[PDB]
């Protein structure tokens, strides 16, 4: 859309992990402002910024909006579409524990965008998480972050780093990354947000290699023995498994119980986000 630094102004803070509430004075617009500071070679720094501009052909209900990455100020900046709602991973501190059934349409709502970066771009998301699904006032559910960029990627090398990781057993184990990977983590978010926290291990801090050694080594983890239905139990437990030979793929859990009543449900997830969120 071409965005320079002039034509933005701060209106507040989102969050960071840093990203902005601006408007775009230009056209109106008011955006989300990524700013990644990478002290990188000038020459892959213009490819991170070739490879984003595949987001203006990313058109899902259930993908974030982009408008446009330029570099200003040793900062990459990635503009997008402002969500009111922030991250399910904001949401779920207000909340406490997410309720099984939004967390039935949350389900469906990644499902439905990681089938679509995977069959009409071939792309994986690679970064599943909470903090990665966001959500809005017209209660929509959108993906975000996703793996866009080899370079960007390369250049965060952010398998390291954090306190949490959502990383696979294969991928921890020299496997090549694939779909059956983006499930383990939703599978572990959902987790996270139904008991109302990061559920490895189960109940001093982890730093993040043992947290990696206890992935591939220990039995997965899985939701408690009353407070859910078998169905979600269910769900949850096939996107575990830890042979992803096993684990279940997008078609198969698009078509599991829990699913097939999630999206009969009649859910008011706008309703209940505002009267929990404010
Ligand atoms: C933790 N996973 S990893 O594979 O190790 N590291 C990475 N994983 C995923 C991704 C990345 C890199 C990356 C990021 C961080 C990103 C952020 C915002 C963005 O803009 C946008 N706009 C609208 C909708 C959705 N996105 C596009 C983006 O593209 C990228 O490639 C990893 F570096
Ligand atoms: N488009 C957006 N609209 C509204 N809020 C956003 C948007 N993008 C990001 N945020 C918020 O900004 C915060 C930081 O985003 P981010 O920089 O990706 O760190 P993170 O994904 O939360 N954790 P990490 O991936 O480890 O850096 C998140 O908690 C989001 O809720
Ligand atoms: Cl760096
Ligand atoms: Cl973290
Ligand atoms: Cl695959
Ligand atoms: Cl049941
Ligand atoms: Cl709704
Ligand atoms: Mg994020």
Same mark, same amino acid.
């Given at each position: ?23 775009? !004075?230009?056209? /109106? ?11 990188? !070679? ?43 709602? /922030? ?51 017209? /209660? ?34 020299? $496997? ?65 498994? !830890? ?32 009267? $929990?969120?404010?």
């Amino acid at each position: 859309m071409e965005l320079k630094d002039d034509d933005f102004e701060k209106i507040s803070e989102l969050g960071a992990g840093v990203v902005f509430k601006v408007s775009h !004075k230009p056209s /109106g617009l008011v955006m989300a402002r990524k700013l990644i500071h990478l002290e990188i !070679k000038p020459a892959i720094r213009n490819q991170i910024i070739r490879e984003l501009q595949v987001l203006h052909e990313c058109n899902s209900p259930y993908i974030v909006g982009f408008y446009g990455a330029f570099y200003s100020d040793g900062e990459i900046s990635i503009c997008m579409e402002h969500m009111d709602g /922030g991250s399910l991973d904001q949401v779920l501190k207000k909340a406490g524990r997410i309720p099984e059934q939004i967390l039935g349409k949350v389900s469906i709502a990644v499902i439905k965008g990681l089938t679509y970066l995977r069959e009409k771009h071939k792309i994986m998301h690679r970064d599943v998480k909470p903090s990665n699904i966001l959500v809005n006032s017209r /209660g929509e559910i959108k993906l975000c972050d996703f793996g866009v960029s080899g370079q960007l990627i390369d250049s965060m090398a952010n398998s390291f780093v954090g306190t949490r990781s959502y990383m696979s057993p294969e991928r921890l184990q020299g $496997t090549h990354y694939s779909v059956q990977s983006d499930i383990w983590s939703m599978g572990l978010s959902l987790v996270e947000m139904a008991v109302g926290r990061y559920p490895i291990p189960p109940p001093p801090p982890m730093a993040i290699f043992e947290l990696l050694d206890y992935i591939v080594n220990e039995p997965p983890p899985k939701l408690p023995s009353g407070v859910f239905s078998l169905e979600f139990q269910d769900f949850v437990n096939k996107c575990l498994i !830890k042979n992803p030979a096993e684990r279940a793929d997008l078609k198969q859990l698009m078509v599991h119980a829990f699913i097939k009543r999630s999206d009969a449900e009649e859910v008011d997830f706008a309703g209940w986000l505002c009267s $929990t969120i404010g």
